[PDB]
């Protein structure tokens, strides 16, 4: 699975 940074990117998506 991807690193957690990428999950945070989705949470903050534009």
């Amino acid at each position, epitope marked *: 699975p991807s690193k*957690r940074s990428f999950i945070e990117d989705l949470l903050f998506n534009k």
Partner: antibody
Amino acid sequence: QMQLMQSGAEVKKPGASVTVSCKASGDTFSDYRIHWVRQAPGQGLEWMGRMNPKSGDTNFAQKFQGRVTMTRDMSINTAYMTLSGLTFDDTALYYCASLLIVGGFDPLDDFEVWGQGTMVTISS
Amino acid sequence: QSALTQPPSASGSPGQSVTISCSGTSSDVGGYNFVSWYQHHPGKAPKILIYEVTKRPSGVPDRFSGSKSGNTASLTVSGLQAEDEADYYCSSYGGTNNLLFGGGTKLTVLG
């Protein structure tokens, strides 16, 4: 593990700009996300925004949108926050940090890393 | 300018428990499970104790526990010790691509 080392204290005049730097070391810089959080005297913690070091993508708090930038120099593993139009309300301790808001698919990397803080004073 | 509401102070006696609250809206505390709690001693970086409402990061003892109902999150500190005197901040994802903070609750350990 990865640590964050910030630039030293500064004083700037009202209306000017200030840049705080945040150098990563100990792990791959691009694996982390850099948030900026400040605390002004007598106030609580205040989130300013976040930056993706790889892409340079950002999100800023509505309160600072229009007079803040967050940038990076990948070649030196350094993140920057520049705050402009400074007022007395911008006198504060400024931190950069890898925050833990949403956790990973496994929890091994569910930890935070904080810089030591940079004091910025706005004065003539 | 704290978006979330926390009472300014709390207290408890050693070995006992204290619960402190953090109130938001349906677009933040009540809309997502991204509530964190930070312990802040003067002069030191904040130390996260709880994330995602209930989870603890490594090294945080189980006497710190978080919960939520509706628009209200709570932190309970049991087995209170003197070293627990600090200002406790809640945070939540919220608004539009934002992280909101409460104003902090300063905890005094009595006696």
